[PDB]
Amino acid sequence: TSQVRQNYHQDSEAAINRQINLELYASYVYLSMSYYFDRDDVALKNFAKYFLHQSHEEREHAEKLMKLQNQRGGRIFLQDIKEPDCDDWESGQNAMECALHLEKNVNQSLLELHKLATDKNDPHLCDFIETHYLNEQVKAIKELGDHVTNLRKMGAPGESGLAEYLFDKHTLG
Amino acid sequence: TSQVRQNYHQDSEAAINRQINLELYASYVYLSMSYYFDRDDVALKNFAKYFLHQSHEEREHAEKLMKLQNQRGGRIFLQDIKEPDCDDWESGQNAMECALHLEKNVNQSLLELHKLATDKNDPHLCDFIETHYLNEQVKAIKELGDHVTNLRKMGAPSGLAEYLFDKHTLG
Amino acid sequence: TSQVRQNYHQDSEAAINRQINLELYASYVYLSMSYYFDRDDVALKNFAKYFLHQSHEEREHAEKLMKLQNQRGGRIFLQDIKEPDCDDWESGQNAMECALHLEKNVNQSLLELHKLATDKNDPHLCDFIETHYLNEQVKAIKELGDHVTNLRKMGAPSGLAEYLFDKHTLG
Amino acid sequence: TSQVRQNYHQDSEAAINRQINLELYASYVYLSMSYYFDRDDVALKNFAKYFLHQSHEEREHAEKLMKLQNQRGGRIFLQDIKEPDCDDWESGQNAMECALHLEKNVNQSLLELHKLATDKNDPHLCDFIETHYLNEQVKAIKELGDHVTNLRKMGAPGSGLAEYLFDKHTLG
Numbered sequence A: 001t002s003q004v005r006q007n008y009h010q011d012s013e014a015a016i017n018r019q020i021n022l023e024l025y026a027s028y029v030y031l032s033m034s035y036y037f038d039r040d041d042v043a044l045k046n047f048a049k050y051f052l053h054q055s056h057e058e059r060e061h062a063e064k065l066m067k068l069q070n071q072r073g074g075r076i077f078l079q080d081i082k083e084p085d086c087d088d089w090e091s092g093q094n095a096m097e098c099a100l101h102l103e104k105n106v107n108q109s110l111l112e113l114h115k116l117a118t119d120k121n122d123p124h125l126c127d128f129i130e131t132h133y134l135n136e137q138v139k140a141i142k143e144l145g146d147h148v149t150n151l152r153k154m155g156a157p158g159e160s161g162l163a164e165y166l167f168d169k170h171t172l173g
Numbered sequence B, C: 001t002s003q004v005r006q007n008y009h010q011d012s013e014a015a016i017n018r019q020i021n022l023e024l025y026a027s028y029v030y031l032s033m034s035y036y037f038d039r040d041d042v043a044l045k046n047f048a049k050y051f052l053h054q055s056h057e058e059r060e061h062a063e064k065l066m067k068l069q070n071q072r073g074g075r076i077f078l079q080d081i082k083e084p085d086c087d088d089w090e091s092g093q094n095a096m097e098c099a100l101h102l103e104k105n106v107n108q109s110l111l112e113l114h115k116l117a118t119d120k121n122d123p124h125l126c127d128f129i130e131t132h133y134l135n136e137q138v139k140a141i142k143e144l145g146d147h148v149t150n151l152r153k154m155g156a157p158s159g160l161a162e163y164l165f166d167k168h169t170l171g
Numbered sequence D: 001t002s003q004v005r006q007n008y009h010q011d012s013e014a015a016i017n018r019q020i021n022l023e024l025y026a027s028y029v030y031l032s033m034s035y036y037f038d039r040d041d042v043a044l045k046n047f048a049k050y051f052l053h054q055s056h057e058e059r060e061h062a063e064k065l066m067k068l069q070n071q072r073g074g075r076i077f078l079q080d081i082k083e084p085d086c087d088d089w090e091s092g093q094n095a096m097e098c099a100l101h102l103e104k105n106v107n108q109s110l111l112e113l114h115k116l117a118t119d120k121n122d123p124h125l126c127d128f129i130e131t132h133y134l135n136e137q138v139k140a141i142k143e144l145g146d147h148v149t150n151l152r153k154m155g156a157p158g159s160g161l162a163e164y165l166f167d168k169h170t171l172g
């Protein structure tokens, strides 16, 4: 037992390690999407910047969980970061929709983590999750929904060939 | 009677209280419209900001009338602020047209208030209305007509029209 | 159902809409009090400013809840904003006591909202309430209690208490 | 007949001259009140400076009316400035009530002026009065009402602290 460990359940420690893996996977997914849009046959430079920014943000999320693990006296256990679902994301609107699904998945995992934390009467963990992750997920999900809605209304794939270009310039640029 | 009251008719006092309520109602309508555009399935950020700004401006018009009522020694009476007609404004052009309708309604109320003030030989009230409200209304109504016209000509409910208008006119 | 909605109970959506109406009501009450102290037969300018500031804060609270409603994927439904209980608030201490009662009623509404969010295992909502509302309410309630206590001790309805408190505390 | 005169009724010209005299009279009244509060047995410095400022503003209102008379082609006719109704203004509250009565009388004269201007179809004069005088009067009157209300609620002579505290904390 660590000299700092107090009121920290083995289940919470394990769940935190799982969340670390999931944030790493999300970073990887966003990296994949970013360089999809860097392809010369896709060439949407602001989509690529947007997703690269998201990837680095997810990496930070994971590092903050690793820090938390150590603060509470748990022990980090790392697993394979699995390859993203695909290498071709097929359009700006589809990439946005995939990111929305990903972030809702991460949110669900964090909500189950919070529920585990309350069931184990770990207020520090409940507040850590509320303070640093829950509103971030809500804000991210809302932003992705707004982006999907706009691409949809614009006719993005294919209805209007200007849609992805204009959205890249005026929303993501 | 108030120690400040001079040449201020009870009909004018009553009309000023009605106008106060109308300005507060306009503020409420604009707040409703603004957050309609903040929905994730509408997502037009500059429409939402535009209408929020108009909402705060309407609140300011109401408070200027409350100050005026007190300045002349009338007494403020507040009524319920009615909920707006819709919670769904359906489109950027529809909301712009509803705003134009609302602004012409407010203007007609202000013109009737000026006609009342004229009948009561209240030049201070006439000039209050002229100075602070009449050209404000004319400018608002011209701006809204301009907006409606551009959204019309752009083909707005072309799927790009609301997007582009939000970016380049309101943004 | 909204594309963004997740772990957001229908009951919580309805409670947030009721809270929006209550915050707007508080804004209306504070506006009414503020311009009570603006009339020439009351004439306490800093009481007026204080209550006007509170009115604008309450409007901000309402708008933040509408933003929240949209963020979570619910739909804003607006209703009449009821006229305040009085148009004449009769004294500075009485207005401060009415404001205390109002803030306590808002706080009780927020506490019931938090309990509902706890029952529905919505930790995002619980922290929204804890972050933006609960301690602001405790601070507002203590500040109002402070004001009431000083006005009570100064002998407020001594003819000087209201004037002195208006200058030396609310100035 | 002035080379600049246009749409300017003789009646309006006469009424402008009467207004000039009234504004100068108001200035004189305020001067009187100011130095009442400067005497050693009254000794309220901020009452004194408030009413002095009021006097100087009244003189400005008079001079602007003289400018208008000349702008429109009228001829200024000046008359005795009457001595004020009182040498002793009795108290801070009483002086503010007298100031309130004075401004309400000037306001009534201005409203009668605007009515005459309306009747003679003189929109330039109507707007001169609206722009420079009507809301000035409304604001002055509301201010004096506020002051009277506070003094009387403080138990001012119409508590021996009320005049002192009002002089320090409101007129300071």
Ligand SMILES: [Cl-]
Residues within 6 Å of the ligand: D005, D006, D007, D008, D009
């Ligand atoms: Cl002529």
Ligand SMILES: [Cl-]
Residues within 6 Å of the ligand: C164, D165
């Ligand atoms: Cl003091």
Ligand SMILES: [Fe+3]
Residues within 6 Å of the ligand: A023, A026, A057, A058, A061, A106
């Ligand atoms: Fe994350």
Ligand SMILES: [Fe+3]
Residues within 6 Å of the ligand: A127, A130, C127, C130
């Ligand atoms: Fe918390």
Ligand SMILES: [Fe+3]
Residues within 6 Å of the ligand: B023, B026, B058, B061, B106
């Ligand atoms: Fe308005």
Ligand SMILES: [Fe+3]
Residues within 6 Å of the ligand: C023, C026, C057, C058, C061, C106
């Ligand atoms: Fe509030």
Ligand SMILES: [Fe+3]
Residues within 6 Å of the ligand: D023, D026, D057, D058, D061, D106
């Ligand atoms: Fe004058």
